[PDB]
């Protein structure tokens, strides 16, 4: 069956988190759970190939970020929605299902928030996987080396411009979000079987917005790194695991050799034939790295 | 308005190199003033200058490769940079029977005249230019928060920026407008001319002839971003730049890489104008150009 199935036994809630309302989907049960943080530009959705491999293994739980998917958007744009802001949220929703410490499972956003919630609300956090694992050593390395010419959409996202051009009509939304979903992806087909259920999300009102929110909100912090003034942190204790896509054209395998810096107990591996979405270019491979890691 | 038809204007499609180049031009004789647009502009930009220097100069305001009514490529190409442009100016200079000439550029222009007196240096007598980007701009490109206005370099030279933009006249307007106000400080200055803006943009191939220069001109851009850009001799001829002080993509302060590059410049700044000095401030761009040229 589809890699973007849906396994029977798949349950959503609108939970009251802070001041929000997130979308959380769940499937499993036993066992300590596994919080899956989506990226941009994804929601919960994006762990349906994962979901379809491991519900059986363990019990999943795959929020929409603050913002994002059905979780609730502002009704005008933000820039105080970072990593802190996501990383105590999932402390939030933690505490609102009564479970005092799972995995946790990041990629892109997703890493942020899952780093600053491994910092923030140490106990919560069991261990960590990361499918690619950006810290503040990057600095200078979102500009040089040719890098300038993938980040041209953390600007661009922050502009009126964007929301107005990319928010048109669904043919101006399927040619931008079909831009990243291929460029990003070394299987260029990995979003083929959803991609139209992509669409459909980034149309909902507010989602263009919610998810610009966070280039917005992360933009000053950015700026600094670049100009060589990393923002201090304690490295993380968690035990951790990095399986980074090799052939990730945004954040690059390269910046693998940042992770040591930021964390006491990291192992790193590459996955060779993916490229930004692991977790949905070579899915088997991502679930036995989860299974293991996790076992 | 300043984009009335001044008199004496005249058009013509002149065969030049493997292309076709709308030229106009206004007089024949006295002092001949060679006029380079930018992106996104084509001939027109020089109708406020046209305007006032009509009775005074032999003005050519060609549409570069790729831009307005001059010849566009069927798909997308990366060999029509600096170097392209030049050759193709030399070449119209010997169409026109033209031995040498004054140059004015800004932006696109700007490098392409730079390339023309570099490679063809017998037909420049003098430059003047209205912003004068260099290879040493470098990092400055994209440091000191720098990196937030040159997105549109890098998205210009997707497949999705042409797709996108050129969905509409609606999405059109609203890209090219954003350029036009943001890049400006008197920020109504092109509203006479807008609705033949977007006009041109709207003109099969325009958006991807445009955005051409930017895939032609990435790889020295991210050579000189860090800090390895290819030396080049010094521009010997006369220079003039008169440099918009809020021009926010080519900041006014690149001004102090100029006498790397040139033996001889003259740098002052029009205070009251961003990126499009020749259009904002139209009088004293004027007065500069007589003064240098006459």
Redesign the interface.
């Known amino acids: 069956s589809s890699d973007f199935a849906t396994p029977p036994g798949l349950r959503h809630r609108q939970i009251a988190v802070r001041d929000t309302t997130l979308h959380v989907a769940e499937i499993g049960s036993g066992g300590t759970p596994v919080l899956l943080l989506h990226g941009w530009p994804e929601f919960w959705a994006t762990w349906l190939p994962l979901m379809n491999r491991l519900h059986d293994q363990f019990h999943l739980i795959a929020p929409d970020l603050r913002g994002f998917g059905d979780s609730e958007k502002s009704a005008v744009p933000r820039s105080d929605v970072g990593a802190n802001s996501h990383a105590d949220d999932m402390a939030a929703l933690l505490g609102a299902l009564g479970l005092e410490s799972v995995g946790v499972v990041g990629h892109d956003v997703g890493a942020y928030a899952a780093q600053a919630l491994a910092r923030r609300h140490p106990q919560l956090v069991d261990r960590l996987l990361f499918f690619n694992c950006p810290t503040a050593s990057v600095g200078g390395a979102?500009?040089?080396?040719?890098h300038?010419?993938?980040?041209?959409?953390?600007?661009?996202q922050?502009?009126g411009?964007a929301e107005?051009?990319?928010g048109?009509?669904r043919?101006?939304c399927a040619?931008?979000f079909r831009?990243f979903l291929e460029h990003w992806s070394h299987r260029k087909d990995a979003f083929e079987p959803a991609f139209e259920l992509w669409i459909d999300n980034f149309m909902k009102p507010g989602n263009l917005r919610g998810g610009f929110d966070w280039y917005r909100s992360q933009?000053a912090l950015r700026?600094a790194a670049?100009?060589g003034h990393p923002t201090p942190s304690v490295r993380i204790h968690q035990p951790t695991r990095v399986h980074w896509g090799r052939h990730d054209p945004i954040l690059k395998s390269e910046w693998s050799a940042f992770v040591p810096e930021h964390f006491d107990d990291a192992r790193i591996s590459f996955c060779e034939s993916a490229g930004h979405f692991v977790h949905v270019e070579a899915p088997d491979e991502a679930a036995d790295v989860l299974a293991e890691f996790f076992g």
Do not use: P
Not at 142 to 146: F, N, S
Not at 149 to 156: A, D, H, L
């Open positions: 979102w500009v040089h080396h040719g300038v010419n993938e980040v041209w959409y953390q600007s661009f922050q502009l411009l107005a051009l990319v048109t009509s043919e101006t040619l931008y831009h933009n700026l670049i100009d």
